[PDB]
Every structure is written in C-alpha cells, then in structure tokens.
C-alpha cells in the first residue's frame, strides 16, 4: 500500500502570487499523479478543502481547529477502492480533547484527525492518525503528541497504526523520544528516495542539507518497503513549501 | 502498463564534475523508484550497461552502434514479472541495416534496438521501438525513421507498438508528419503531468517554456490513460539533460 503525507500550506496573502489560489492545481495534479492509497493533508482552511474535493479523485475527511467549520483544518483523503473508512474522529490537543480549546503550552488550537481502515483485500482494520504539531515550542510539541497518545491509546495499542504528518521537529526533539517507544520512523527502515529533509520554504534551489527535517511518517505494526521524499515542482516553484513524504507499507 | 523512455546522457568527460560517475546513482534510483514495467534508454556506454544492470533492479537488453561492443548504445530495460521478451533485434539506420553503416545523410552510425514482449496477463504480444534520431539535420531525421518504418514495416503492421525515444526533433519537423502517418503522441490523448518538454540542457532553473520537446512516447494499438515528464532532481542539478518521460497505457 502507498501511503503520503503532505503539508500543502495554508492559504494566505502573505504567500502574495503563490497564494493557495496560484498553486491549488499544482498541489491537486500532484496528488493525482502519485494516486496513494490515502494521504494526510495539514493546513487547509474550507476553501482549501473545497478544492481537495474538486480537484482530485480522492474521497475526503475532513475537521478543522476553530469548531465553526471555518478554521484551518486537516483531511486524510483516500480512495475507497483501495481503502474504506469504518471509523472516524477528531480532538483538540488539550486538557479538554472534546472541546475547542488550547493546550496550556500551545500557541493556538491544534487538532489531530483519525481514521480506521481497512484495505479492500485485507480483513483486519487499522489506524491512520493526522498530526500537525504546535511549531510554538518543543514544549508545546511533547505536550500535544502526549494527548494524541493518551487519547487514541486503546485504539493505538489495538490495531497496526499509521502515525503521519507534520512534527514541527527536528529529530532530536522529546517528541520523537516519546513517539518512538512505539512506532519506528518508517525513512530508516528500508531504501528512501530523494532528500531525507521535507521543509524548502518555497526556496527552490534550497540546498538538501538545508531542509528541514519536520515531516514523518511513523509505523507500528507494519513492513516498510521504500519511503520518499517528492520533489514534483511547477515551472521553478514548489507547489508548497513542504515536499510530500511517502511510504510504501504492508500488513503483518 | 508503465513505460517509459529516457536518454540518460553519454558518459563524457565533458561534463566535467557532472560526468557518469557522479550521476550513476541518481540516474538508476530514479529507474528503480519509477519502477516500470520497462524503460527505453539513449547513450549509454558499455560503463553505463554496466552500472544499469548492477545497480537498477531490471533485465537488461542492449545493443551498441559500433559494432564491435564498444561504442555508444541503447538499452531496453524490463521487469520480467510484468513482461516477458520473446524476441529482439536492432539494426542501422542506413542503407545497410544489417552491417554497421552510416546513412548518407548522418554524421555517425545509429542504430535501432526493438524488442517484440508480451504482458504477463495478456495473451498478445505487443512491438517496442527504441528511438535515437540523428542530431545532425532534419533530413537526417527523416532518413533515419525511414529505415525504422521500413526495416519493422511487417512488425509494425502485425501488432500494437510503442515506439519511444529521442527523435532530436520539435513537434514541426517532417520526421513527426512521417510518424503520425501510423502513430499517434501518447502526451496528447489523455492527461499530462509536468513540462510537455524534456531537454533542460543540466538547467535546473530552465524555464519550462524553453524545455526543448524532443523525446517521444508514439503508440499505435493502446489506449493512453496518462502520460508525464519526470523533474526528480539531486540536490539542485538534474541526473540526466533529459527529464524521463513516461506513460500508461493499455492494450486493446
């Protein structure tokens, strides 16, 4: 199964002639064209999502941070004749995970987005879970991936599980300590394709060893076969300032 | 099906500290992640045989057009679990195809390497045709894929046929109205990811607009479902002065 993860960048003036509205087809095109599985999607406000929808062949779950349906927002998209979505949810990382609400540590409100899966030829279920960390602090970081641990901890310790998206972290983070008492992250375990960093600031000639290395996918429960870096640019852009990152994985 | 095809540039010494030798690995892990179900190679030496059957995982056809082992050649790479060859040939592109020769009109010897394959499933096999046309003139061109047409008239005629490579011609020159005679560009029947051009001369900020379209994916007897020109790149330069070029398709 080929699986991605993907920070898209959230649609802002700041980005001026590569806002969302310049790059949308750019970034739907290059979903299209690698035709995962499924991919978790970080920083989409509603517009953003709207275009997901529109312009790709992918199915689409979707939450977003504020609860007024209108906030920045994640979506895990995936196509149903590949994998189908038993089970769905999604909580604030913080000391109220059912409410909108900000952790202590945190800068604003954070969500995490999980689905259940199931491939179509397999029978047993697994956990596909979305992070977007704060990138306030390391403090804030460890914070929030500790809600997601205790939160989905029954549902984690249950099936092979996916953990995918952006840390906001170097390597060398708490964070990573913590998440790999029980994942392992999937770029060290088999042959990885392009640069082992994942963050270009929309710098296209940014040199690999200046990438930051803040995206991962992490694996429990699963072989890795390959994993990738992709760096799909639209006439000397990047259509987002974060690669993709993908994994190809099997059940065991 | 998957196929591509991808001139991976002559080892020259030229290129200076971008020569084979430093472009090798990026130019065969490319191979082995876009991982098709076969790949047409132009100008490869026998050092770049040889590193194209030690460190890509693909069988391994080829053909030189010197004669003598020696000299500049082509290559066609296939996975034997997707298809199977049951014949191959090559011949020059000459007035004497059958001897190492040089057309009146061409500046060196060029030859023609093709292979007749069937896909593991499928019943039928279908014509492959690996295509380097002369540099030297349009003329030259035309008189090279003259000898192809003729030379593979009976093959042609008899089954479907992908005939791919480096015609060293934009889309005006009179060797493609030869072409279209029986074959149609796969980049025009379906969706296209990417540049519609492939030669960015190791350029990596070259404008798309100023790609030159010289390399080709000509089918006759397949439906096209998508088609795309490659921009994987190694930190800042380009593994080849080609992009791969490459397409699905299926027979009918």
């Not at 062949?57 to 995936?78: H, K, M, N, P, V």
């Not at 599980?161 to 375990?189: C, I, P, R, W, Y």
């Not at 694996?219 to 640019?233: E, H, I, N, R």
């Amino acid at each position: 199964m080929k699986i991605a993860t993907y920070n898209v960048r959230v649609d802002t003036e700041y980005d001026q002639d590569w806002q969302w509205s310049f790059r949308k087809e750019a970034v739907c095109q290059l979903i299209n064209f690698h035709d995962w599985s499924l991919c978790c999607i970080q920083e989409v406000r509603p517009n953003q999502v709207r275009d997901l929808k529109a312009y790709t062949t992918f199915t689409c779950l979707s939450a977003e941070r504020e609860g007024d349906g209108q906030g920045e927002g994640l979506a895990i998209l995936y196509n149903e004749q590949k994998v189908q979505a038993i089970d769905t949810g999604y909580f604030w990382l913080s000391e109220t995970p059912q409410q909108p609400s900000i952790h202590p540590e945190a800068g604003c409100p954070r969500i995490a987005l999980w689905g259940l899966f199931k491939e179509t030829t397999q029978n047993t279920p697994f956990l596909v879970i979305n992070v977007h960390l704060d990138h306030i602090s390391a403090h804030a970081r460890l914070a929030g991936m500790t809600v997601i641990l205790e939160e989905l901890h029954d549902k984690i310790a249950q099936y092979p599980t996916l953990l995918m998206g952006d840390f906001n972290a170097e390597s060398g983070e708490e964070v990573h300590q913590l998440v790999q008492k029980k994942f392992q992250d999937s770029k060290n375990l088999a042959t990885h394709y392009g640069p082992r960093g994942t963050f270009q600031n929309f710098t296209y000639t940014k040199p690999w060893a200046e990438l930051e290395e803040i995206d991962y996918i992490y694996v429990k429960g699963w072989q890795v076969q390959q994993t990738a870096s992709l760096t799909d640019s639209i006439d000397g852009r990047f259509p987002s300032d974060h690669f993709p990152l993908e994994a190809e994985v099997a059940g065991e």
